[PDB]
Amino acid sequence: MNLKDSIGLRIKTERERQQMSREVLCLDGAELTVRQLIRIEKGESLPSLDRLSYIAKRLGKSMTELLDQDNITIPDEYYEMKNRLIKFPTYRNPDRIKSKLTLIEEVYEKFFDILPEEELLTLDILENILSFTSWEESPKVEEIYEDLFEQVKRKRKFSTNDLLVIDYYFFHLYGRKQYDKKLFERIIKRVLNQEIWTDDVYNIVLFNDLMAIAALKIFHNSFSDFLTVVDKALAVIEKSQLYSYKPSVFVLKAKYELLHKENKKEAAENYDKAIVFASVLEDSVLEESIKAGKLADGLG
């Protein structure tokens, strides 16, 4: 009997001894949903610290009592590998030897039996992030993402994990003409209000989120708050010194001048700053790509 089975059985056993329905325990779903609790009690999922804290409080127990002998401590090495996955650099500035593929398999081989549901979803998102179209793969995943996104849309302060879930939501909006604009607007507002501090990992996820929002706004021809987005992206870049990201921001400005301000001259100038920065960063693939971008937009 593994960790998940033990904790799950303990929790279900205690809940049923109090004759508490799943719905009663889960309340409004903000901290735990019925399907989450079900996966925990079937030992399909391990609870996280937050979950366990909620469950213990609801049942009137202590976390120690629900844990018994079992240990759910997640080793620092996992968080280091996750951080390295998030900060994973382009193939033009490779760090050391290991691929993302290798790091992900290594994270599973070392830590799978002790990873809670949220971390696993975060990992699936990271794995598939550079190519989210290449991913339309699980009913189980959509089911897990859906409740976690339900929870996310109640929060005012986001975590790293929250933001990765939000990035996957943005991907849900991809290529879609019909969508809930009110939800998208609330999400955007809340992302834009997140504090920028000294966590580079967080700041990276926030950045990629901002790019996704900009892209979506370009696709929707909705340029309200676009410069708010751009400025926030730039504030991130400055705070964590992510200068390899800066040309793409200038490209965004270009697009804004082009498709909204319709100022081909400024558009062209922004492209030129992007090209020059890439050039003087010596990512030549990026430079060439941006030049081709300027031609593509008719500013050649």
* N→C terminal distance: 66 Å
Radius of gyration: 22 Å
Order of helices and strands: HHHHHHHHHHHHHHHH
Oligomer description = monomer
Number of helices: 16
| Helix fraction bin | 55-70%
Shape: elongated
Q: List the domain count as a whole number.
A: 3
CATH level-two architecture of the largest domain: Alpha Horseshoe
Task: Please characterize this protein's 3D structure.
The chain has 300 residues and is mostly helical. The chain folds into three domains: 65 residues, 434 Repressor (Amino-terminal Domain); 42 residues, no CATH class; 167 residues, Serine Threonine Protein Phosphatase 5, Tetratricopeptide repeat (Alpha Horseshoe). It is 66% helix and 0% strand. The protein is built from 16 helices and no strands. The termini are far apart. 27% of the residues are buried.
Question: Which features does this protein show?
Answer:
monomer; mainly alpha; Serine Threonine Protein Phosphatase 5, Tetratricopeptide repeat; 3 domains; 16 helices; elongated; TPR-like_helical_dom_sf; Transcriptional regulator; Cro/C1-type_HTH
Give a short summary of the structure.
This protein is mainly α and 300 residues long. Helices cover 66% and strands 0% of the residues.
